[PDB]
Ligand binder design. Structure first.
Ligand SMILES: Nc1nc2c(ncn2[C@@H]2O[C@H](COP(=O)(O)OP(=O)(O)OP(=O)(O)O)[C@@H](O)[C@H]2O)c(=O)[nH]1
Ligand SMILES: Nc1nc2c(ncn2[C@@H]2O[C@H](COP(=O)(O)OP(=O)(O)OP(=O)(O)O)[C@@H](O)[C@H]2O)c(=O)[nH]1
Ligand SMILES: COc1cc2c(c(OC)c1OC)-c1ccc(OC)c(=O)cc1[C@@H](NC(C)=O)CC2
Ligand SMILES: COc1cc2c(c(OC)c1OC)-c1ccc(OC)c(=O)cc1[C@@H](NC(C)=O)CC2
Ligand SMILES: Nc1nc2c(ncn2[C@@H]2O[C@H](COP(=O)(O)OP(=O)(O)O)[C@@H](O)[C@H]2O)c(=O)[nH]1
Ligand SMILES: Nc1nc2c(ncn2[C@@H]2O[C@H](COP(=O)(O)OP(=O)(O)O)[C@@H](O)[C@H]2O)c(=O)[nH]1
Ligand SMILES: [Mg+2]
Ligand SMILES: [Mg+2]
Lengths: 432, 432, 4, 132, 433, 432
């Protein structure tokens, strides 16, 4: 029954996973032990003869610390021991270590557990892979996993939730290398991928949630909401609700051009004066405000090739259509000459739920704008520049070569990135 | 030529079809349980055409409900006349078509096709004399478009001597922002040209415009659009369902309406244009009723009849009126605008009158026109198709299902040839 | 466009 | 000039006669088929059946081609998913082996240097030994 | 016995058949169950059974069951034997090729088998009376197939037709001009005498005379019925003119192809037209030359006469008729062809014109039916021929016929024969030798 | 990557190492008997890194004490926390090395080497996952310099995949033991370049200058010098011993700190500078603590950081302090002194904060810098080496042990090449 398997790799993967599953449990009324009092949630949770709801997920890390916290946490008992896999030593921010050295020692075990989750599926839709671009595991293990999932599951859909590195939110010097290496390797195995710029989340946490020094919990709770909006269509049966796969068809016109920009609104702090309320026109206007984006880029000076709206809560068609209009008269939303305008809208019945001990305010209505813009290529360009700075002097390269990698693999990855940049250029030029 | 087997495919197909059954059952005096309660025996005289006589006082629709998604079956069965349909006739899949014609025509569709054909066989063999088939579907989606046309060709193999009549909804960017719609419609049109005997072109562009411009509904809903469709389907089928001028079936209609094989696409129209909740006073005379049904604003296809010429016309009037007043008003129109009716088809505008009026309306008139102006509808789809195709946009979803670019170029070619054909008879003059 |  | 009653027949419920008002203005001469046969009629009907059933047979021929096309597209989709897997399998094996060989060689080279250093240290001890 | 077999094909044929057999039953005192109260001549149209039951020498045929099912369940159900009412499952759908080739082939041997059965009950079969429309797929296609076969099985026996001529105001379908010409060509050599009934002409009379602004088929058929009984009164009763089927060809048909007489009837008075005085001979005689009373819309003033019969019914005396001819002769043209004499073959049948009690026609002491052969009839062919040419030029609807096994060449051949017929009607009217 | 094996070699190696254990045991709440007595559980979380868990409530250092002389090891054993060490781990000789590198590397040392390797084997096999090794030694003497480097290469053979980290004290004529020190240091440097992954350059010239010029101690002692070393060792090891920036081990540090293999010599530094036991304690503010990062006077290596450029920087802050205030002060330094940080290594200065302050100090900051300025230290040793070598002075002490002049010329060459390499990246520009 149209099931979806979530895979969480590395620290970021696992940590976001914890925020996502906590939030899903809340939205479906599932308790930390897997029980629910007295449907579409079955796509993400399987059942036992005990009435226990077990997430269709596998948590992986080459190191034990992060998952050990899950194994001892509030959500222990929610996951079966077999679905939380750990190694002894991490990839030490080295893509080559996560992909070949350390990676090779745990891959067959991970696949065996994925195969076990897959046998419990009467119509597996696909996979949702959560990982960072920067980490040695997040980069190399994910790439290795995607290559293997392509062999075991052929064309079967694979979506990514990728954490984009930011200086202000704990990066490492070699993260630009791992980002490009993983991007190149995963490019043909990934069907769709949602980047989450850590600087963008950091900025929202400060400029909206009023947290001077945001923690990973703050960052992850915000990401969780955006992930929940994307997955709501799959976890709920709504009347005017458009399925994430329908947005996908509109979002990806060419296999390589599969990186949608995500925007969310309203992001209101729990401490500020609640009385104000919220209108459909206000959130639609905020959907085009760059301060609300998940990736730091400029769509205003760029072209659209899809523009989708995901509503949740108390939203009526009369309001939305008025909101899709007026804003396109005032703002300049340029579309490509081979694409129609018109925003693909999906409205879910279930309002946006919040974690009780969280810093996010409860709202009657919320929106998530997934759009395919040429402007996303700016994020690749920033990463590519940092890679070029270091690679010119072959700085840190020896750590990768020492693990069995070749210098040629670095150039091939960068060549693919240049092709991707040129691909995003060509896609924006008008026809004859 | 007595019994017709109805088939409804996809979301639109099952939605529109459900309303048709609600409407006809009410007119034939059949309650949602399947029992007769009507006044006059004239509602029973030709009941066998759409209804099967079950054990006792139970009349069951000769309808086959088809979808690759369970969603639609669940809603139709809960719907007003959901308990009237034969449970065995619900042929529904689990994994949908993803609004992809290729999935409906080749992949998922081809896996469910035989199950449907088994139900069509069962229904066909319980007919004293099978008149033909009627399909309701949209050309914009994946099941209705793909599987619907696959059903048509497969039925055509088994029943070559039987009439194939379709109610085909044409996509519009005004109502539905699913980008691939021009591909699905172009691939469907090609099939309809080859395999149908008669096609009622229900254009969503025209339906939207009637609701918006005429009915003054700012945000039209599918229900508003479907209210116009049910009126047209009730009106076009009157002659097959009621003793209002006997000995006329699906074949007599095709023989007199279609002068050339490929040119079997009708421009429907209804008068007066009504709203579900608009409480209208007891008025309207035949001269204004005739005037409305010949106007562009009353057309169910977004074509200006004044931009082409009529090959053939069929007009059906309902209610207690003067037949004398009807014929006089018909030629009044013909003689006044002669440049719009082909000279080489003597007496090409035929009229029928039925004493039974529809629900609420004391008198109405449905219009069936075979006009060369329908090329405007095909050109519109062709333009939308090329815009995308010129840049091979969204092609991977189709080639991924095993399709080739050759199939697309061919579908486009046949679409262009059909346009040439319409123009060929638009310029044709009987001077030599 | 939000029809319903 | 006048009217002539020629007169015809008579019966119980009827009477007939001829009225010749004006005589005819003229009096004169003008005031392979080999049909029908059951063979000619049936030859016409059998030729008409032949034409009708040939069209039907040619219409089924076009549909038989459509049925076989759908077969080749389903096959393309499967051949392409099978090859995608085949290529992905060997490209991964190639990479995995290429990375194994490289790392193996790097760790061997660095062990070879350490071994050369060990050889020099044994040569140093012998170099210290000078019995005199 | 000088017995006649009536064949009714398609909806029109069957429906007119119902009106005719109703009127015959009434005129001979036969009840709807076939019982009589007790001049012998009715036996030519009705056979007798061991029960004293009078069964019509008729066969009703249709490729569809609806029309004949109504007869099978109707007032006249205990009148026809089940075997003489034959039906198929699917009709010819206004396609001549379907009625002739496709659907037709499946029922022909069965129809012929039943005609052979009726024929064995005949000690002197005169011939056949075929009732059909020009427009219908069955009316056109099946009738032509039937005529071809009746010529083979019954050689030289007389075959008369009662053909319904299509009219826009009286139903009609777009392809009816095609079927009309196709049937005309095919039947032309297998028909000895044929009476066309223009649906517009009947419609008009039903509007101005019977005062029905919207006439039904029952109204139309009841009027046609009266004209048919006029034509058959001589066969059914001990009459003196048109006493045999061969006599029709002798009194009207001078050349095989020139076999289409114009029929005129009078008086056509409405039952609810108050209770006015009865207008005698010379008044009904003058109405015999009034174009408003014709069965086919054409102009005999333009035309040339080559035969003229006067069928007087009821209380009519020779002294009155001759005085009525004397008055009509003076000042009125009525131009005859050089070779033909100018005059009439008169006939009086002492039987009165009977009317259906629940009908819209007034009972009269005396009536008249004129059967005349005029060149003016070619005008009706010309109207049909023009409509055929309009569509055929663009090959419109042709595919429906070709799809059923017919050839495009068959269309041209039929039209060529019609042009020849038009030219034959021209040639007859010009100076002889 | 969990357990670290510590090795102490020679007089300096055992002296410095003994103080490190005294300091860290106090920081982890361990008494001289080996039992835990601390308050917070955070002292125990990462105890396994440096300590083995013995039978009962005991914690034994994973340390191997090595010397060719019995003296120092006896004094350590009797000294504070000397009883804490495993008696079997004391691998000592009787002959000594006579401050001669050759005796330690070839003669005396090669006879005791296997006995040491047997103890390293035992300790290594009792590790769940061996992180790596840490050696404390001087480059000036004979045991630490010669046998220490011999231990490194022998360990490297057995554990090539393990990280090798050293705390290496550089000689100075200002604070000396023997004239031959420049020979011993040059022969040692060559080994460290080839066989270590990370080396903390503890310069006795810098230690003497801090004690003399800053601490105002006229006649500094090895205790005064070692007090500065223990502070630096405590600080540099913090993230391995306490959680927070955790998922960080010896390899993650090497990967991010070393861009080129040979350039793995770090310039340590501490703030505030303190005298042994003799600290009255005054509040040192975060902006002041960060000010002593560029301070040449705070460097444990006698190099002016302003004479070179930073490849990479790691800064660790200890005590209760505002993390917000830390990053802003760190950023100010980078923007104001941008000409001293390589442009071709984006975000090359990383900061970590730990709530646990060192002994006595309420707030402190340790600095780990990979600066090209370290070539000043190597040039100094190189100049001292040549002065002697040019006149073949004291060479018979080395040739007498079987060594050749070829070995000396080679050691000098590698030392000069290392200098060239530092200069090469000092002058390297991004080409803006
Ligand atoms: N938003 C967010 N980012 C994270 C989180 N954890 C790590 N990151 C980011 O991801 C990168 C760190 O990679 P990690 O996921 O911690 O490393 P890893 O995948 O576990 O692989 P290893 O190198 O073996 O430790 C940096 O850019 C961090 O800012 C998290 O919980 N939330
Ligand atoms: N006068 C008269 N005309 C009729 C009647 N029925 C049909 N027609 C006319 O005949 C033509 C219709 O042909 P039909 O006889 O109904 O068709 P059919 O012979 O049954 O053959 P199919 O096409 O198979 O239905 C039109 O011109 C009608 O106006 C009738 O009862 N009376
Ligand atoms: C286990 O101990 C340490 C380990 C590391 C770092 C470090 O200094 C903060 C340590 O403390 C000494 C570290 C160092 C330098 C970096 O480059 C400047 C870097 O990107 C990244 C780091 C580390 N990453 C972070 C986010 O601090 C990982 C390795
Ligand atoms: C079964 O229902 C119908 C069937 C037909 C017709 C029609 O429209 C009046 C119908 O209602 C839709 C019909 C239509 C059009 C014609 O001309 C284009 C014609 O000549 C003729 C017709 C029909 N005949 C008549 C007399 O209306 C035959 C088929
Ligand atoms: N008029 C009308 N159009 C519909 C309805 N539902 C969907 N459509 C249209 O049909 C197309 C989508 O086809 P759909 O039936 O929903 O997809 P399918 O189930 O894969 O065949 C689009 O052009 C929609 O605008 C409906 O109820 N009424
Ligand atoms: N900082 C420091 N340096 C020392 C200490 N002991 C000796 N040294 C230095 O180390 C060098 C002598 O090495 P040493 O360890 O005493 O000789 P070894 O036992 O043969 O390795 C000289 O440069 C001394 O200045 C000490 O406790 N602290
Ligand atoms: Mg990690
Ligand atoms: Mg019929």
């Amino acid at each position: 029954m149209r099931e979806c398997i979530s895979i969480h790799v590395g620290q970021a993967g696992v940590q976001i996973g914890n925020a996502c599953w906590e939030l899903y449990c809340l939205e479906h009324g599932i308790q930390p032990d897997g029980q629910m009092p007295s449907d579409s949630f079955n796509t993400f949770f399987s059942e036992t003869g005990a009435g226990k709801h077990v997430p269709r997920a596998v948590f992986v890390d080459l190191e034990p610390t992060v998952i050990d916290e899950v194994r001892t946490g509030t959500y222990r008992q929610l996951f079966h021991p077999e679905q939380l896999i750990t190694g002894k030593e991490d990839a030490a921010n080295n893509y080559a270590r996560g992909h070949y050295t350390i990676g090779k020692e745990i891959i067959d075990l991970v696949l065996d557990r994925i195969r076990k989750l897959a046998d419990q599926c009467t119509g597996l839709q696909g996979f949702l892979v959560f990982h960072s671009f920067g980490g040695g595991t997040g980069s190399g293990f994910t790439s290795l996993l995607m290559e293997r999932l392509s062999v075991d599951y052929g064309k079967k859909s694979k979506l990514e939730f990728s954490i984009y590195p930011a200086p202000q939110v704990s990066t490492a010097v070699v993260e630009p290398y791992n980002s490009i290496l993983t991007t190149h390797t995963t490019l043909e195995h990934s069907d769709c991928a949602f980047m989450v710029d850590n600087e963008a989340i950091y900025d929202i946490c400060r400029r909206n949630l009023d947290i001077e020094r945001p923690t990973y919990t703050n960052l992850n709770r915000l990401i969780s909401q955006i992930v929940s909006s994307i997955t709501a269509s799959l976890r709920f049966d709504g009347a005017l609700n458009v399925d994430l796969t329908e947005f996908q068809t509109n979002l990806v016109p060419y296999p390589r051009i599969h990186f949608p920009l995500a925007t969310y609104a309203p992001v209101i702090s729990a401490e500020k004066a609640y009385h104000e309320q919220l209108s459909v026109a206000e959130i639609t206007n905020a959907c085009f405000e760059p301060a609300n984006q998940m990736v730091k880029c400029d769509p205003r000076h760029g072209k659209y090739m899809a523009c989708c709206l995901l509503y949740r809560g108390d939203v009526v068609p009369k309001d939305v259509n008025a909101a899709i209009a007026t804003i396109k008269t005032k703002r300049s939303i340029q579309f490509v000459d081979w694409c129609p305008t018109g925003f693909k809208v999906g409205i879910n019945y279930q309002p946006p739920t919040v974690v009780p001990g969280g810093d996010l305010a409860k709202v009657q209505r919320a929106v998530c704008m997934l759009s395919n813009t040429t402007a996303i290529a700016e994020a690749w360009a920033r990463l590519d520049h940092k890679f070029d700075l270091m690679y010119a002097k072959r700085a840190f390269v020896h750590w990768y070569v020492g693990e069995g990698m070749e210098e040629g693999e670095f150039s091939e990855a960068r060549e693919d990135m240049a092709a991707l940049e040129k691909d995003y250029e060509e896609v924006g030029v008008d026809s004859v | 030529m007595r019994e017709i087997v109805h088939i409804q495919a996809g979301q639109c197909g099952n939605q529109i079809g459900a309303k048709f059954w609600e409407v006809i059952s009410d007119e034939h005096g059949i309650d949602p349980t399947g029992s007769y309660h009507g006044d006059s025996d004239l509602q029973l005289e030709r009941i066998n055409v759409y209804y099967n006589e079950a054990t006792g006082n139970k009349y069951v629709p000769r309808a086959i409900l088809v979808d690759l998604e369970p969603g639609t079956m669940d809603s139709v069965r809960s719907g007003p006349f959901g308990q009237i349909f034969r449970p065995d006739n619900f042929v529904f899949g689990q994994s949908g078509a993803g609004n992809n014609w290729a999935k409906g025509h080749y992949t998922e569709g081809a896996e469910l096709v035989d199950s449907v054909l088994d139900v069509v066989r069962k229904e066909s063999e319980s007919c004293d004399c099978l008149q033909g088939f009627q399909l309701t579907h949209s050309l914009g989606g994946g099941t209705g478009s793909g599987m619907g046309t696959l059903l048509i060709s497969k039925i055509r193999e088994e029943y070559p001597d039987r009439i194939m009549n379709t109610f085909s909804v044409m996509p519009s960017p005004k109502v539905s922002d699913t980008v691939v719609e021009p591909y699905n419609a172009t691939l469907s049109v090609h099939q309809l040209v080859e395999n149908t005997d008669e096609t009622y072109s229900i254009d969503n562009e025209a339906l939207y415009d009637i609701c918006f411009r005429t009915l003054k509904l700012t945000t039209p809903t599918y229900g508003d659009l479907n209210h116009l469709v049910s009126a047209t389907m009730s009106g076009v089928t009157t002659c097959l369902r009621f003793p209002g001028q006997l000995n006329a079936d699906l074949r007599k209609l095709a023989v007199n309406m279609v002068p050339f094989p490929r040119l079997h696409f009708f421009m429907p129209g209804f008068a007066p244009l009504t709203s579900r909740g608009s409480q209208q006073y007891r008025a309207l005379t035949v001269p204004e009723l005739t005037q409305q049904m010949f106007d562009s604003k009353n057309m169910m296809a977004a074509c200006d009849p004044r931009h082409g010429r009529y090959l053939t016309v069929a007009t059906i009037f309902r209610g207690r009126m003067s037949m004398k007043e009807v014929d006089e008003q018909m030629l009044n129109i013909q003689n006044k605008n002669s440049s719009y009716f082909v000279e080489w088809i003597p007496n090409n505008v035929k009229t029928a009158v039925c004493d039974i009026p529809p629900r609420g309306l004391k008198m109405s008139s449905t219009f069936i026109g075979n006009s060369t102006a329908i090329q405007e509808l095909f050109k519109r789809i062709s333009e939308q198709f090329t815009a995308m195709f010129r840049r091979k946009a969204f092609l991977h979803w189709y080639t991924g299902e095993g399709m080739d670019e050759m199939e697309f170029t061919e579908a486009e070619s046949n679409m262009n040839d059909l346009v040439s054909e319409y123009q060929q008879y638009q310029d044709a003059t009987a001077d030599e | 466009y939000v029809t319903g | 000039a006048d009217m002539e009653v020629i007169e015809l027949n008579k019966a119980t419920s009827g009477q007939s006669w001829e009225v010749i008002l004006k005589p005819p203005s003229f009096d004169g001469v003008p005031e392979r088929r080999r049909d029908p046969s059951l063979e000619e009629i049936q030859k016409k009907l059998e030729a008409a059946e032949e034409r009708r059933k040939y069209q039907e047979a040619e219409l089924l021929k076009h549909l038989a081609e459509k049925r076989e096309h759908e077969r080749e597209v389903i096959q393309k989709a499967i051949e392409e998913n099978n090859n995608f897997i085949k290529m992905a399998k060997e490209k991964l094996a190639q990479k995995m082996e290429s990375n194994k060989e490289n790392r193996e060689a790097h760790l061997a080279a660095m062990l070879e240097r350490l071994q050369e250093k060990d050889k020099h240290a044994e040569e140093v001890r012998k170099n210290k030994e000078l019995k005199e």
